[PDB]
């Protein structure tokens, strides 16, 4: 049952991202329960992302060494148990929660690095490509379901610990289902990797695309981590009051916007390719620029009303998510086949490091600094978070400029890549 195995793999990816973003779903409850400032709230996700980073290449190497299904199932069980423990950590110990988040990041990196290898090993046809596509679509749905499930469980059970308690049972069930259905598939060096690296750094468009993807990761992390709290605080500032509904709406919009952005980016790049060879990078920039504007407008709109802010979420999320499907094409066309795997690994590492790894903690630090320098009140908390988020669209614009430079150098570095292949 290879098709059923890949179906369970997609479900496991959905649950992986669900568990990843559950904490962001119940961000406010965690912060109020532990009495921790915004800095720790961002530090949770920062530690998670750093663990994901330091785990992805090691888990890839391990998969290259040992079987993939065993590692993946062990990981599912591992992070399921870690989250279940996270739901029981004492209130007085917050470092325990941070450590549990780090371990969950390790496990989820193991899954994210092992699953595509399993999918590729199972089949090597259009059906296998479709399985890879369904596994990829599990990501935005996973995040949206994470925010929705966290908010719904926290509101229904009257305790945010239940939002974390629900997921591990599904994790264990999905791990057993994976271990049973997935069939086992079978399919110096450091110096060679260093040569490949040096070659990559010699490339201009690859470096520019890596920096722009890092900016995209920064924006995505910071926003996905701080926007539900921002919506709750905006509602608090306004006379109208419900912050669980806002997180639910944000999750639904995030899922729908991920789908819409992927499809529209694919269509737009398809059209623009016929006009000019540099279309694939250019498109990205354009989108992000638009997104940047909207990503800023929301904040102002967030002070006026929440519905306009949600429309801004829709448009900006679509524009920002349009970039992922095209970044892979840019990387594939820029780098030669031999150095493509190393290029992908290095790009992922750089995108998580320069961006996502330090974005949430930076937003929290800026918000806390603005709060401390000023009078303390819910409105000033809202304003501090708004400024910290407003920092992001500037990074999005910088990433758009990086994509523009990638567009400029795409033809010349594509010409350099093909000449090397021929020789």
């Amino acid at each position, epitope marked *: 049952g290879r098709g059923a195995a890949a179906a369970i793999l997609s479900l496991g990816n959905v649950l992986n991202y669900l568990d990843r973003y559950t904490v962001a779903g119940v961000l406010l409850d965690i912060q109020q329960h532990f009495g921790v400032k915004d800095r720790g709230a961002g530090l949770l996700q920062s530690v998670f992302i750093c663990s994901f980073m330091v785990a992805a290449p090691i888990f890839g190497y391990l998969g290259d060494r040992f079987n993939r299904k065993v590692i993946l199932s062990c990981g599912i069980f591992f992070w399921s148990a870690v989250t279940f423990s996270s739901s029981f950590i004492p209130q007085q110990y917050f470092w325990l929660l941070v450590l549990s988040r780090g371990l969950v990041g390790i496990g989820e990196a193991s899954y994210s690095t092992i699953a595509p290898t399993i999918i590729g090993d199972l089949f090597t046809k259009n059906t296998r490509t479709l399985m890879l596509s369904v596994f990829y679509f599990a990501i935005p749905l996973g995040s949206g379901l994470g925010y929705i499930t966290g908010s719904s469980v926290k509101q229904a059970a009257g305790d945010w610990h239940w939002a974390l308690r629900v997921s591990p049972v599904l994790g264990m069930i999905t791990g057993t289902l994976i271990l049973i259905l997935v069939p086992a598939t079978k399919r110096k060096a450091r110096t060679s990797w260093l040569r490949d690296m040096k070659a990559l750094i010699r490339n201009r468009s690859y470096v520019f695309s890596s920096l722009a993807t890092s900016a995209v990761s920064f924006a995505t992390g910071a926003l996905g981590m701080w926007i539900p709290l921002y919506l709750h605080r905006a509602q608090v500032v306004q006379k109208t009051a419900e912050g669980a509904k806002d997180s639910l709406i944000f999750g639904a919009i995030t899922c729908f916007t991920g789908f819409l952005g992927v499809v529209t980016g694919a269509g737009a790049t398809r059209w623009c*390719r016929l006009k000019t*060879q540099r279309a694939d990078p250019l498109v990205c920039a354009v989108g992000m620029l638009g997104s940047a504007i909207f990503i800023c407008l929301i904040f102002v709109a967030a002070k006026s009303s929440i519905v306009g802010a949600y429309i801004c979420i829709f448009v900006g999320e679509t524009l920002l998510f349009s970039n992922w499907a095209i970044t892979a094409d840019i990387l594939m066309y820029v780098v030669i086949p031999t150095r493509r795997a190393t290029a992908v690994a290095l790009q992922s590492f750089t995108s998580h490091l320069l961006g996502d790894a330090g974005s949430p903690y930076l937003i929290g630090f800026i918000s806390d600094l603005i709060r401390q320098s000023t009078k303390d009140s819910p409105l000033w908390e809202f304003l501090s978070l708004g400024y910290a988020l407003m920092l992001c669209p500037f990074v999005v614009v910088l990433g758009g400029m990086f994509f523009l430079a990638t567009a400029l150098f795409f033809v010349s570095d594509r010409a350099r*890549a*093909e*000449q090397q292949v*021929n020789q």
Partner: nanobody
Amino acid sequence: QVQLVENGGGCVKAGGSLRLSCAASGRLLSWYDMAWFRQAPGKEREFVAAVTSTGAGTHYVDSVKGRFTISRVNAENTMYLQMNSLKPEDTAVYYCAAANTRLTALSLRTTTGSWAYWGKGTQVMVS
């Protein structure tokens, strides 16, 4: 979705110069790798030359190396093969082939089966 039109092929004396031009207008030519394949009257089509979609890398078969030069202009969406020091063995129908851009070595792509596009071709003769 590309149409290939070959022109410039005719009778030329031994040792003369002749240019064969392949034009494409269905889709932007920068997205396709191109090649010239010559078919003899009693033999199957053989590899003459190939050029990448960008025009940086060019490949020629051993028999033709040093006499024919392949150069493509993406601005005119065309590919010109200049042939010099023509010999009687060069007599054949030269067909133009275009293929979807892939990072596969041209020397490996001499099976005349990877090119998904083809044209009627322009005949050439020597003395």
